[PDB]
Amino acid sequence: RCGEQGSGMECPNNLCCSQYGYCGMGGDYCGKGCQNGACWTSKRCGSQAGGKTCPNNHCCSQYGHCGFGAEYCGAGCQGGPCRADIKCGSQAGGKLCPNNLCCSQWGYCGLGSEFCGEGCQNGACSTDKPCGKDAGGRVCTNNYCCSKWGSCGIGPGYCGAGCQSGGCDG
Amino acid sequence: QRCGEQGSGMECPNNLCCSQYGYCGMGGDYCGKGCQNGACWTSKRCGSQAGGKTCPNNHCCSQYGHCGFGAEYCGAGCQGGPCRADIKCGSQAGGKLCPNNLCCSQWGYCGLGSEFCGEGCQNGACSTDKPCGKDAGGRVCTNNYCCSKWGSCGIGPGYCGAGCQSGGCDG
Ligand SMILES: CC(=O)N[C@H]1[C@@H](OC(=O)NCCCOCCOCCOCCCNC(=O)O[C@H]2O[C@H](CO)[C@@H](O)[C@H](O)[C@H]2NC(C)=O)O[C@H](CO)[C@@H](O)[C@@H]1O
Ligand SMILES: CC(=O)N[C@H]1[C@@H](OC(=O)NCCCOCCOCCOCCCNC(=O)O[C@H]2O[C@H](CO)[C@@H](O)[C@H](O)[C@H]2NC(C)=O)O[C@H](CO)[C@@H](O)[C@@H]1O
């Protein structure tokens, strides 16, 4: 299942999540009731939608609609994989990258070893620095949960029993 | 309920990692060894370097065939996903299809949204929903989409199952 019926799961290759939480293509999926993917009626995002982000890594246009191509990812792009470089980190007042993108040592948002590897400042860093009581009490970035084992992440093993800090369950 | 191979190739929201066990999260247990999609610490391979495989989660395929985001991945040499360069398609570019079900606009560019998927859309996830099959003079869908017994194009058991007239029907 996808969307609401499956913890916000998204379909592969821009397939549409129907109102019943099934992946497909055509009116019964992409038409009325479409939850995510290549929905015929584009989702709202950005300033026009209270800062809401686009699903499926779609770009948020200057008009607050989700999609792909120059009109969405080009000039005035508000979110998603915008064509413009996106600044983050201590170079930009500690600004986080949206959608868990990694902030590189240089203060740019992205994914891949150049971003998530050595010097990664926030997001889905691969550096896996220890947190919690055995790490001076370092809290994770992005409000990620610090597990009882002193590692940062999201999931029952991080946010559940023994969660030391972050988005711990409650 | 599950992601990855445990959940019909399902993908996590917001680049969350699908663990080797088909659950969504962040950190080593999900993004580390066994990660299936999302922000895997070891980026998936794509493009020419990997048999033309496309990146999951709509990540960019860099010139070197690794999945990710940023100028290094979506900029110069980008082979797939939301590349920064405009992507040509349709009659303007020899009837080329768009990847990942993206719509080919009236102008022959790949994208998503009404400008691309609306009037004049040539292939991909067009919202124009033009008829197919016995009542459309035997016309077939683009992208090898299934034509349902009802005469509409799509993918799913209602389109590809019983009564399927053309496309990638079941069997
Ligand atoms: C982006 C956005 O948020 N769009 C909204 C918004 O949509 C619009 O506002 N649409 C207005 C239609 C666009 O008309 C505005 C004029 O644009 C000026 C530029 O010239 C227009 C035609 C030439 N553009 C063109 O041919 O673009 C193509 O080629 C370009 C290369 O030159 C390429 O960069 C573009 O990506 C191409 N665009 C397509 C669709 O192929 O509201 C809609 C209704 O709620 C909504 O559905 C839509 O999602
Ligand atoms: C990371 C970053 O912030 N890049 C920024 C940043 O870029 C720079 O600062 N670039 C200037 C030089 C970078 O600083 C040099 C030190 O960093 C070294 C990083 O290591 C790069 C080594 C080459 N990597 C490589 O080949 O990766 C490929 O193979 C890897 C191993 O298999 C694999 O993990 C990668 O995924 C591969 N990369 C790609 C793109 O496929 O600012 C730019 C604006 O000025 C901005 O556009 C750019 O996005």
From Swiss-Prot, chain B:
Domain Chitin-binding type-1: 1-42, 43-85, 86-128, 129-171
Coiled coil start-end: none
Organism domain of life: Eukaryota
Cited InterPro entries: Chitin-bd_1, Chitin-binding_1_CS, Endochitinase-like_sf
Chain positions recorded as substrate binding sites: 10-12, 62-73, 114-115
Keyword Repeat: yes
Disulfide bond residue pairs: C3-C18, C12-C24, C17-C31, C35-C40, C46-C61, C55-C67, C60-C74, C78-C83, C89-C104, C98-C110, C103-C117, C121-C126, C132-C147, C141-C153, C146-C160, C164-C169
A Pfam short name: Chitin_bind_1
Keywords on record: Chitin-binding, Disulfide bond, Glycoprotein, Lectin, Pyrrolidone carboxylic acid, Repeat
Residues that bear Pyrrolidone carboxylic acid: Q1
Molecular function in Gene Ontology: carbohydrate binding; chitin binding
Function as written in the Swiss-Prot or TrEMBL entry: N-acetyl-D-glucosamine / N-acetyl-D-neuraminic acid binding lectin.
More info: The 4 sites proposed for binding to carbohydrates (N-acetyl-D-glucosamine) of receptor molecules are on the surface of the agglutinin molecule.
Record text on subunit structure and interactions: Homodimer, u-shaped.
Protein's name according to its UniProt entry: Agglutinin isolectin 3
UniProt organism field: Triticum aestivum (Wheat)
